[PDB]
Design a protein around this ligand. Structure first.
Ligand code: C8E
Ligand code: C8E
Ligand code: C8E
Ligand code: C8E
Ligand code: C8E
Ligand code: C8E
Ligand code: C8E
Ligand code: NA
Ligand code: NA
Ligand code: NA
Ligand code: NA
Ligand code: NA
Ligand code: NA
Ligand code: NA
Ligand code: NA
Ligand code: NA
Lengths: 341, 341, 341
């Protein structure tokens, strides 16, 4: 008659996240600036379901999750389905960690996103950049991913392979594989990652991409913390063209009582095609944030950032290649709340 | 081990609503009548999640809600995302009421919908009418809305501002602001509202709209209740054209034991453009309903209505302006159930 | 303060289902084979809500359900809305069974799907076939369905009528009706069903379809179980053309301890148009499966199947008629898990 934790085979969880963001664009076209700029709300709130089950006849515990998408992001319409964010089944056991099948972050993307896309560094460092093909996937369906245990309390590995975007619709044979490693050393964590994408169809060619990342995170007792990463992207097209572009991201934090101050910087350097530097193909971003720990489950923040994007380039089909800079440079001021349950 | 109300940081709620609706169209084209008319089911059922949190370091209580859309409405395909209906975050405190950010009803729209679009008066009084620009938003994303407390147990105010439909996609600079007030006087409630829409792009112009509303609702001890509203819509286009149209809606109810009888009527009067009446631009609807209070949480109803729409007009670009009458006049018989938990 | 079953007016339920499926196509075009074939994950996981209410003033119990769609199927993108699968309201009472309004399986479709489309026989026997018009609906909105009680513990009937696919959007006047009956006697069940579709618009004509089904299922105590069905499809177009096609499906199972071995076969025979057999319009599939009962609430399985589809035909507008064979023959190896809560 009376319920316990065991009465249910699932848990609802949520991230309630609302940002009010004012953008000021300087694209060169005043109408486009009026259109893209101004105040919006960016509602990144999402609901998920998850659970576990010890099957009677198999030792590794079954796990599963189904996570909804952002319910009303800026620049988009209302509503999200279930299964748009990390959504998987899997198994776990103490001695070998976990394996997940479904829709998860790639090992490389996970590091690109956290720590290195925060606060607002993502237009440059996440999906920014000018390279052809596919530098990496991000959250990707049709994936198998292994997460190792924390060996000797210090070292862990994440490895995955998956189908590409066209392959997932029965429209291509693209695929990828990736791996990351993490090592904890006193106040530091060292990070390294790789992703290779193959059979990528774009601009009339087939591409292979290889992306490499090295990074550090540190947390010191006097309240200073930081991160830094360097990311190296290479791409080869089936007509013989080679491209390379590198990038970096860094952040510095000072935490005192219920406050975190943060500065962030990220940059993509000029792209190189067949040994030649394409001028003005770099991007950068500077960001400042103050965050208040309003509760153990929530934060309030204020943020200011300035994005200075590349001036454009063509792809290998002689048409403009789309980048995060195609819509122009902008600055943004924002405030927000996030709450976790 | 045993659960309480406090074990969860969310509540699921729902409105389970099904209507079987038979429409008989008289559009002037027999094939169109056959297509638009006939029996459908209108499943307006929806699920929502909501909760609150007292943040340790902030006095006003945090509130949130994520509401799904109608799961299978008539004239539409199956399935709704989370966040299609009222979906927001906010804060509340006894002395100042509540503030919500996200997707909510405008102050004007809320009164236009309830009481004045029920039962089935909405084709005329909600989204019906012939005026250019945007007479008002309805449920709108990118909104901040304040709801005052009930001052002196009599008077309350709802005020809001938000981004327009194009601005929410980064495709324009439309916006709007609105306010409503409610005053209790014996068995009556008096209502007034305003909305102003700006930078609305349509028919090759930019438009400003101003809409005003005044109303009454009454509930008497002998079982009679009623509502009546008058609504005045004005619009100015950037080429100098002015338009005006007004409207009304009224309803009379008799409640006895577990039954409510209801008659409803709404009309849009002829539109005026630059001081000249456009003939046959009016609409009206008459509706009758019997409702049974089948449970404290539910109702059953039967409803009959007749819609007589305008005979068409052009917009300022010399093409037909779409209205709720464009698909033709129709009558409708329906039965339904609604249940709340 | 403490919660019971009665504290909630709804239950969450789910089917967590993941299949890893490798397809090898032989379409005649090596690029198309590369595109459609390869490994995908087919995530058929879904979440639902359901509940009941005894209304104070009505004896038949109110029932409802809202079921989400597959969260990330193969050949499709991520995310599903609530209300994509069986989503309805209804009433139930011991003496007359249940009545549902909304989105449910048709009586014919329910038998076509289970037992007769498992394991992987659906390309041929569910949506396969070459006949014009609409052989039957499957899961359909705008439906009323009655499920009788089990009379004398042996005999039951399911009957339904509904609006068609165009009618549901206000774009046509299609409709259907169907019925099925089941008789249980010792270790056998006999099945029979019918569906008639009317006013179906396709290929420049209006169609009527009539589809008939007879079947048997058996379950014996020595671990042998089986099913077999015969399905007869007839269609008449408004220009006088008659089409007929028949089909079958059968399966044999052997269950011992926690294992089920299964073989399945289904076929569509050559279609006949105006008394003439259209050569090479048949399809068939053979499938083998081993299933392990890993828990009382879950299964693991491995499956191999070979599909051999028709070589194409034209519809009555002299263009290719789409069938489940249009993309070419393929074989498939898969493994999966399903778990129910
Ligand atoms: C980007 C890297 C940021 C590094 C932040 C500083 C980390 C720690 O600095 C404080 C050093 O702690 C040792 C204290 O040294 C002073 C000791 O003086 C003598 C008293 O015993
Ligand atoms: C302690 C680490 C210090 C690292 C300093 C290296 C900074 C590199 O800055 C230049 C990279 O290019 C980014 C600037 O791009 C701006 C956009 O350019 C407009 C036309 O491309
Ligand atoms: C200022 C508030 O006044 C409310 C007056 O109510 C008028 C209702 O008119 C309805 C006409 O159909
Ligand atoms: C308060 C509602 C009473 C409405 C009855 C008016 C009937 C007028 O018929 C108009 C025909 O259309
Ligand atoms: C508080 C009592 C409210 C009394 C409501 C009376 C409403 C009168 O009916 C108006 C509907 O008129 C329908 C057709 O008339 C068209 C004339 O156009 C100009 C409007 O004055
Ligand atoms: C002259 O009348 C011809 C009919 O015109 C169509 C108008 O629609 C009905 C409007 O009812 C409200 C009138 O104010
Ligand atoms: C369409 C033809 C498929 C026929 C397969 C029938 C095989 C079933 O074997 C039954 C023999 O049973 C011997 C053992 O009986 C144990 C008690 O069973 C009670 C009835 O299930
Ligand atoms: Na804008
Ligand atoms: Na939005
Ligand atoms: Na991708
Ligand atoms: Na119709
Ligand atoms: Na519908
Ligand atoms: Na709007
Ligand atoms: Na493929
Ligand atoms: Na998929
Ligand atoms: Na259908």
């Amino acid at each position: 008659e009376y319920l316990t934790k065991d009465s249910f085979s699932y848990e609802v969880y949520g991230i309630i996240a609302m940002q009010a963001a004012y953008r000021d664009y300087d694209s060169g076209d005043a109408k486009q600036d009026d259109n893209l700029g101004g105040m919006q709300l960016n509602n990144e709130s999402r609901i998920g379901f998850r659970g576990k089950k010890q099957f009677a006849n198999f030792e590794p515990t079954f796990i599963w999750q189904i996570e909804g998408g952002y319910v009303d992001p800026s620049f988009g319409g209302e509503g999200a389905g279930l299964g748009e964010r990390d959504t998987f089944v899997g198994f776990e056991s103490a001695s070998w960690g976990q394996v997940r099948l479904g829709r998860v972050l790639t090992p490389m993307y996970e590091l690109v996103d956290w720590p290195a896309s925060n606060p607002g560094l993502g237009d440059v460092y996440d999906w920014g950049g000018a390279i052809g093909g596919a530098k990496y996937q991000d959250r990707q369906s049709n994936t198998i991913r292994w997460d190792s245990p924390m060996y000797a309390d210090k070292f862990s590995i994440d490895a995955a392979v998956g189908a590409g975007d066209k392959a997932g619709l029965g429209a291509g044979d693209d695929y990828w594989g990736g791996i990351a490693a993490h090592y904890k050393l006193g106040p530091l964590q060292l990070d390294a990652a790789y992703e290779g994408n193959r059979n990528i169809e774009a601009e009339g060619q087939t591409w292979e991409n290889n992306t490499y990342l090295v990074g550090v995170q540190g947390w010191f007792e006097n309240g200073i913390s930081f991160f830094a990463q360097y990311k190296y992207m290479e791409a080869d097209a089936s007509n013989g063209v080679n491209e390379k572009q590198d990038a970096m991201s860094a952040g510095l934090m000072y935490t005192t009582g219920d406050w975190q101050y943060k500065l962030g910087y990220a940059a993509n350097f000029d792209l190189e095609r067949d040994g030649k530097t394409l001028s003005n193909t770099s991007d950068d971003v500077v960001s400042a944030q103050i965050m208040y720990f309003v509760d153990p489950s929530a934060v309030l923040y204020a943020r200011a950032r300035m994005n200075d994007f590349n001036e454009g380039l063509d792809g290998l089909d002689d048409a403009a290649r789309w980048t995060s800079g195609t819509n122009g440079d902008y600055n943004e001021y924002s405030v927000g709340v996030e709450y976790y349950f």
